[PDB]
Structure formats: structure tokens, C-alpha cells
């Protein structure tokens, strides 16, 4: 029959990021010679809001290390980062909220956000509003640093990786009930075409494996194998557990 809707999102026709009103990507400053052997000092020129992001971004204005010009970097602001602040980024940079240190220089148990999982990555992780890592221990022989992240899993990043001290801006967002279909409207408007979402048992059998009839019901177990082909994987994909978690929630 017809192709499932989870497969049609894979074309990217209507379902792409909207992202027009967005300001561009948010990254840490480039890793330079100064970044590695010293620190570069900028100043926070503003704090604003991407459409479709829950955090709060920052235009931080460094001076160009080489030519005569002034470069503006856009990074995800920590919690108490205020306009006019001076942000230090580099190896010599002191340990303070918003400064960016190489993650091997930071104490033992510090709170860290916006980590880069690869030394030059300009940060990929702990970037979502309110989220932070916890760096655990530095391994001085192998040159690694172990840290938990937000999902509870504990990873090991090469300690030349950089990091930004302090939790991410937004906080909450989630703790507040939406209350109406209406507030969910511009919710995703800045994000994607995710919504509203018809559940599978309602739609006809061509379109979905759940597409049954007399009584809305799946008719066959909803847990699906890992090796199931696209258009078949639907519902709970290789579930180890199912139903209420009564005690436990081991990190997934």
C-alpha cells in the first residue's frame, strides 16, 4: 500500500526545518593558536532568542587575532551571562561562569555545559536549555576526562576538548503546562511540521501497520525488531522493557 508517514518524513519535502527566522548556527569560537596557547577576551554584546530554540543565545564580540577587524561569535549563553560581561576563552582563561576552558583544566567536579565531544568540535553536547554535564575525573596517563552528561550516561572525552562553565540558560519551559492546542501551534511553527499528529490506529491499513478496523487496536504486538525494514518499524522499536516502570529507570 501507500508509504508510511514516518518514511515520508525522510524525503525532507515539507518536513524540513523551518529555520528562516533563526540566526544561524550557535558554536563556540574557533580553536586557534591563541585559543590553545593563551586566551582571547570578548565582550557580550547582546542576548537574544532564536525562533524554535528554548535556550537564549549571545552575540559575543572578540577581536580578530590576525587581521584588523572584529569578529562576532554566536554561542549558547550560560545561566547568569549578562550583557557587557567579558568572556574569556582559551587555555589560560580563569575558571568562572561563562568562560571557556579546555576541559582538562577544570578541577574535578565542576558543572559544565556546551561541551565539545571532539577537540575541535566547537561544542556539540549539553546544549539544550537547562542542561549541563558534570565532569567526573581526569585521567592523566591516557589523556581522557570522564563525565556524565544529561542523560546520565558517562562518556570519556579527550581532555584537550573545550567546555563552558555553568548550566544552560533556558531552564524549565517543560515544567509549565501548555493548556491549549493553541499554544502548541507556534510551538513547532518555529521548529518543523511535527504536529498535530494522528495516531496510527486511526489511519487506514494501507498507510500504517496499525491501520486496522472494527475496534481501534493494533492486533499484533507493538514491539518491533531492530532488523525490521523501513515502513515496518513502528511503535516500540526493540523495547527491552515495556509498561510502567515501577522502580529503576536505568540510564538508557
Amino acid at each position: 500500500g501507500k508509504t508510511v508517514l514516518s518514511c515520508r518524513k525522510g524525503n525532507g519535502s515539507v518536513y524540513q526545518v523551518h529555520g528562516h527566522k533563526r540566526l544561524g548556527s550557535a558554536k563556540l569560537r574557533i580553536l586557534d593558536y591563541a585559543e590553545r596557547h593563551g586566551y582571547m577576551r570578548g565582550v557580550v554584546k547582546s542576548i537574544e532568542h532564536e525562533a524554535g530554540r528554548g535556550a537564549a543565545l549571545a552575540r559575543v564580540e572578540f577581536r580578530h587575532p590576525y587581521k584588523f577587524r572584529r569578529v562576532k561569535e554566536l554561542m549558547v549563553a550560560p545561566e547568569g551571562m549578562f550583557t557587557g560581561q567579558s568572556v574569556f576563552c582559551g587555555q589560560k582563561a580563569p575558571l568562572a561562569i561563562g568562560n571557556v576552558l579546555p576541559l582538562g583544566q577544570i578541577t574535578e567536579g565542576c558543572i559544565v555545559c556546551n561541551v565539545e565531544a571532539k577537540p575541535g568540535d566547537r561544542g556539540t553536547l549539553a546544549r539544550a536549555s537547562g542542561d549541563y554535564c558534570i565532569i567526573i575525573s581526569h585521567n592523566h596517563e591516557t589523556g581522557r576526562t570522564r563525565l556524565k552528561l544529561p542523560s546520565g550516561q558517562k562518556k570519556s572525552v579527550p581532555s584537550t576538548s573545550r567546555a563552558m562553565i555553568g548550566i544552560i540558560s533556558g531552564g524549565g519551559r517543560i515544567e509549565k503546562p501548555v493548556l491549549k492546542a493553541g499554544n502548541s501551534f507556534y510551538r513547532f511553527r518555529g521548529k518543523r511540521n511535527c504536529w498535530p499528529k494522528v495516531r496510527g490506529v486511526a489511519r487506514n491499513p494501507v498507510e500504517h501497520p496499525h491501520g486496522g478496523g472494527n475496534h481501534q487496536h493494533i492486533g499484533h504486538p507493538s514491539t518491533v525488531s531492530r532488523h525490521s525494514p523501513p515502513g515496518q518499524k513502528v511503535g516500540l522499536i526493540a523495547a527491552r522493557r515495556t509498561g510502567r516502570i515501577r522502580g529503576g529507570k536505568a540510564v538508557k
Binding site: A56, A77, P78, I167, S169, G171, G172
Partner: protein
């Protein structure tokens, strides 16, 4: 006089969305429309702008504080621990 017994800022949803979910939003709803102390100027001037952007009316400072309040509760520890954790390394 006092024109509602309990509902408060949520009287704009007349009968509608249910008691407990309304009552739960009311907390976070009065928080963001509240004016928060500005440790820079000293006024209670901050107003929430966008999500997390807090602007002072006296200072004109903007802050990344976040959500429905200026400082989320686990920000205080993060700011206090690093004040400790920087100080401890200096010696």
C-alpha cells in the same frame, strides 16, 4: 475590591482547562510577569523578554537567567560551587 477568590491571573481561562493544570501554571505565570531584583542597579526592574532573556529597566542590562524566573534554583549552587571551586584552586 477583590474580584476573584482564588483563580487570580488565570481567570482569563473562564471555566476551561481544568483546576489542577490551571493552578499549576499560575505559579510560573505570575513568576515571569513579576519584577525581579536587579543585583546591578538594586531596583526590582527585571521583566522577562522572550524565554530566558531578562532585561532590567534601570540598568538596561540583559541577562540569560532563564525560564519563568531569573535564577533557577540549581543556578545558585553552580554559581556558589565555582566561587568555591575557583577559590580553592588559587591557593
Amino acid at each position: 475590591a477583590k474580584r476573584t477568590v482564588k483563580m487570580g491571573v488565570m481567570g482569563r481561562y473562564g471555566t476551561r482547562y481544568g483546576a489542577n493544570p490551571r493552578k499549576r501554571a499560575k505559579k510560573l505565570e505570575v513568576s515571569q510577569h513579576a519584577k525581579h531584583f536587579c543585583s546591578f542597579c538594586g531596583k526590582f526592574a527585571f521583566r522577562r523578554k522572550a524565554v530566558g532573556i531578562w532585561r532590567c529597566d534601570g540598568c538596561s542590562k540583559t541577562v540569560a537567567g532563564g525560564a519563568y524566573t531569573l535564577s533557577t534554583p540549581n543556578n545558585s549552587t553552580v554559581r556558589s560551587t565555582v566561587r568555591r571551586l575557583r577559590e580553592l584552586a588559587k591557593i
